[PDB]
Amino acid sequence: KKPHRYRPGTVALREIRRYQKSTELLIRKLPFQRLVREIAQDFKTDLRFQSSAVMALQEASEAYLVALFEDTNLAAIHAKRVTIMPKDIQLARRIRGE
Template identity: 80%
Template structure:
């Protein structure tokens, strides 16, 4: 072996790391959307139905958890539809 030789980094095939990250995020239960922007969105949508609504912090966290769980489920199904069509990239018709 040569002195001072640097070992070449292991390179994964395209998409391997992305799939690993997807599995990791699907398993995690932590919230991925930032809390404040989500809170602003909920309040903005609620304004359309009734003004001066107040939300408990636990209610907002519950809404966020349910929303993220729904989105994960939606994108899982979307990804399966793309794979079934022999595509890697998801398109709007997969949803």
């Protein structure tokens, strides 16, 4: 036979429409939870984090990365491109002052 063989980019907008209308959390909780502990280990060895405390940190980081990805994305069309680059991210942080 012959598979359907979706063209490169068609599934990209399909994932764009799905994640822009559903509010599920894309990052898994446990990998983000353990990353918080190793970051906070450099500031305080004997430290604990609540279940809702890690919950509050994750959505703030998720929305910040998505907003950064939004500024990263429209920089490509400004640069006559469709692919995000690390120099586009450094463009976004410098303009935003971060």
